[PDB]
Write an enzyme that holds these catalytic residues in place. Structure first.
Site, PDB file in Angstrom:
ATOM      1  N   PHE A 203     -22.916 -37.357   7.764  1.00  9.03           N
ATOM      2  CA  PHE A 203     -24.026 -37.016   6.884  1.00  9.03           C
ATOM      3  C   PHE A 203     -23.829 -35.615   6.327  1.00  9.03           C
ATOM      4  CE2 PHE A 203     -26.516 -40.362   8.820  1.00  9.03           C
ATOM      5  CZ  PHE A 203     -25.859 -40.452  10.034  1.00  9.03           C
TER       6      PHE A 203
ATOM      7  N   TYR B 209     -13.892 -42.912  -3.017  1.00  6.95           N
ATOM      8  CA  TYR B 209     -12.603 -42.387  -2.571  1.00  6.95           C
ATOM      9  C   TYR B 209     -11.557 -43.464  -2.334  1.00  6.95           C
ATOM     10  CZ  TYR B 209     -15.346 -38.146  -1.993  1.00  6.95           C
ATOM     11  OH  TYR B 209     -16.146 -37.080  -2.249  1.00  6.95           O
TER      12      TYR B 209
HETATM   13  C1  LIG Z   1     -14.352 -34.931   1.240  1.00  3.05           C
HETATM   14  O1  LIG Z   1     -14.971 -33.983   0.393  1.00  3.05           O
HETATM   15  C2  LIG Z   1     -16.274 -33.834   0.526  1.00  3.05           C
HETATM   16  C3  LIG Z   1     -17.176 -34.861   0.276  1.00  3.05           C
HETATM   17  C4  LIG Z   1     -18.556 -34.592   0.419  1.00  3.05           C
HETATM   18  C5  LIG Z   1     -18.944 -33.270   0.788  1.00  3.05           C
HETATM   19  C6  LIG Z   1     -17.986 -32.257   0.999  1.00  3.05           C
HETATM   20  O2  LIG Z   1     -18.265 -31.002   1.399  1.00  3.05           O
HETATM   21  C7  LIG Z   1     -19.595 -30.497   1.213  1.00  3.05           C
HETATM   22  C8  LIG Z   1     -16.658 -32.559   0.867  1.00  3.05           C
HETATM   23  O3  LIG Z   1     -15.636 -31.664   1.035  1.00  3.05           O
HETATM   24  C9  LIG Z   1     -15.475 -30.522   0.056  1.00  3.05           C
HETATM   25  C10 LIG Z   1     -15.453 -31.047  -1.320  1.00  3.05           C
HETATM   26  C11 LIG Z   1     -16.745 -31.220  -1.749  1.00  3.05           C
HETATM   27  C12 LIG Z   1     -17.078 -32.230  -2.662  1.00  3.05           C
HETATM   28  C13 LIG Z   1     -16.056 -33.015  -3.237  1.00  3.05           C
HETATM   29  C14 LIG Z   1     -16.404 -34.265  -3.833  1.00  3.05           C
HETATM   30  O4  LIG Z   1     -17.578 -34.865  -3.292  1.00  3.05           O
HETATM   31  C15 LIG Z   1     -18.221 -35.676  -4.144  1.00  3.05           C
HETATM   32  O5  LIG Z   1     -17.791 -35.994  -5.254  1.00  3.05           O
HETATM   33  C16 LIG Z   1     -19.399 -36.311  -3.604  1.00  3.05           C
HETATM   34  C17 LIG Z   1     -20.565 -36.178  -4.624  1.00  3.05           C
HETATM   35  C18 LIG Z   1     -21.000 -34.687  -4.614  1.00  3.05           C
HETATM   36  C19 LIG Z   1     -21.579 -34.332  -3.313  1.00  3.05           C
HETATM   37  C20 LIG Z   1     -20.535 -34.406  -2.345  1.00  3.05           C
HETATM   38  N1  LIG Z   1     -19.814 -35.741  -2.288  1.00  3.05           N
HETATM   39  C21 LIG Z   1     -19.285 -36.224  -1.132  1.00  3.05           C
HETATM   40  O6  LIG Z   1     -18.549 -37.232  -1.245  1.00  3.05           O
HETATM   41  C22 LIG Z   1     -19.552 -35.630   0.159  1.00  3.05           C
HETATM   42  C23 LIG Z   1     -19.595 -36.670   1.277  1.00  3.05           C
HETATM   43  C24 LIG Z   1     -19.513 -36.097   2.664  1.00  3.05           C
HETATM   44  C25 LIG Z   1     -19.465 -37.132   3.699  1.00  3.05           C
HETATM   45  C26 LIG Z   1     -20.698 -38.068   3.556  1.00  3.05           C
HETATM   46  C27 LIG Z   1     -20.660 -38.629   2.159  1.00  3.05           C
HETATM   47  C28 LIG Z   1     -20.831 -37.517   1.122  1.00  3.05           C
END
Ligand SMILES: COc1cc2cc(OC)c1OCC/C=C\CCOC(=O)[C@@H]1CCCCN1C(=O)[C@H]2C1CCCCC1
Length: 128
Positions: A55, A101
């Site tokens: 989460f 992903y």
């Molecule tokens: C695997 O990468 C992450 C994914 C998410 C949060 C992150 O850190 C806060 C993450 O690591 C650092 C990079 C941060 C965001 C990168 C891309 O993430 C995203 O595109 C989506 C949508 C924007 C909010 C974040 N997000 C994510 O996929 C989070 C996930 C974290 C694990 C639970 C599902 C959400």
């Protein structure tokens, strides 16, 4: 609960109509206008894997999550989903791996072939 309600009542907002991104509006925004590609977008969100083992919340960082819409900073489902949202809207998104992903995943945070759920609040969005 919330994800199952999205399976059940969610609008399919993909172009291909493959139920890859399903949406319910939980609190209505205002304004006629949704973000255009290029906009700087400010949201709060709560996200999790369908497997219930991870989460993540913007609130965990005590600050909004900001990104440029359509500029490939976020998963495809966010570019699609947040473009449908109005200022002040809270929405639920259920997302198949193809719009997140994929088969590779993003290890170790995201496994291969993961379905994701988000609650998103669209706080504000401004033009480039
Ligand atoms: C695997 O990468 C992450 C994914 C998410 C949060 C992150 O850190 C806060 C993450 O690591 C650092 C990079 C941060 C965001 C990168 C891309 O993430 C995203 O595109 C989506 C949508 C924007 C909010 C974040 N997000 C994510 O996929 C989070 C996930 C974290 C694990 C639970 C599902 C959400």
């Amino acid at each position: 609960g919330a994800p199952a309600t999205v399976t059940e009542q969610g609008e399919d907002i993909t172009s291909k109509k493959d139920r890859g991104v399903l949406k319910i509006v939980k609190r209505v925004g205002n304004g006629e206008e949704t973000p255009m590609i290029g906009d700087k977008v400010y949201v709060h969100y709560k996200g999790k894997l369908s497997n219930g083992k991870k989460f993540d919340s913007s609130h965990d960082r005590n600050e909004p999550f900001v990104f440029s819409l359509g500029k490939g900073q976020v998963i495809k489902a966010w570019d699609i989903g947040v473009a449908t949202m109005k200022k002040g809207e809270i929405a639920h998104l259920l997302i198949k791996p193809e719009y997140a992903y994929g088969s590779a995943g993003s290890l170790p945070k995201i496994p291969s072939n993961a379905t994701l759920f988000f609650e998103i609040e669209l706080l504000d969005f401004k033009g480039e």
